[PDB]
């Protein structure tokens with residue numbers, strides 16, 4: 001449902017030059033460690049939670 | 050018979066669906082896009 005909650009933020013690359021990469025949390029609460037590892041692999045430093 | 054939004058925390062188990070699951074349909078669309086080898090795509094959606 002969160003993609004419903006962020007419709008304007010999703011559509012905002014049409015308005016501006018912003019590039020957006022969208023990732024989903026796993027169903028397990030403690031399984032954020034591989035996903036956060038991609039944060040250290042893609043060098044992505046501006047994260048919206 | 051129509052796809053509905055499935056709440057992930059729902060634990061009902063007395064239903065079946067016959068519309069194809071949109072996870073598999075989106076996987077097929079992604080495979081078609083990778084086969085045609087695009088770089089800049091546009092997704093136009095009607096309902097949220």
Ligand SMILES: *[C@@H]1O[C@H](CO)[C@@H](O[C@@H]2O[C@H](CO)[C@@H](O[C@H]3O[C@H](CO[C@H]4O[C@H](CO)[C@@H](O)[C@H](O)[C@@H]4O)[C@@H](O)[C@H](O[C@H]4O[C@H](CO)[C@@H](O)[C@H](O)[C@@H]4O)[C@@H]3O)[C@H](O)[C@H]2NC(C)=O)[C@H](O)[C@H]1NC(C)=O
Pocket residue numbers: 076077079080
């Ligand atoms: C009943 O429903 C179940 C729940 O959805 C089904 O389980 C799911 O099945 C799908 C495919 O049937 C599984 O698919 C894929 O994941 C693998 C590996 O993911 C690996 O990479 C991820 C990276 O983020 C991790 O998150 C994973 O945990 C694991 O590390 C991919 O390699 C697959 O791609 C394969 O398919 C696509 C098709 O487009 C190709 O492009 C690929 O190159 C490759 O061909 C899938 O994306 C899924 O893991 C699984 N489990 C879930 C969602 O929890 C079940 O299949 C279904 N049916 C039954 C039981 O009959």
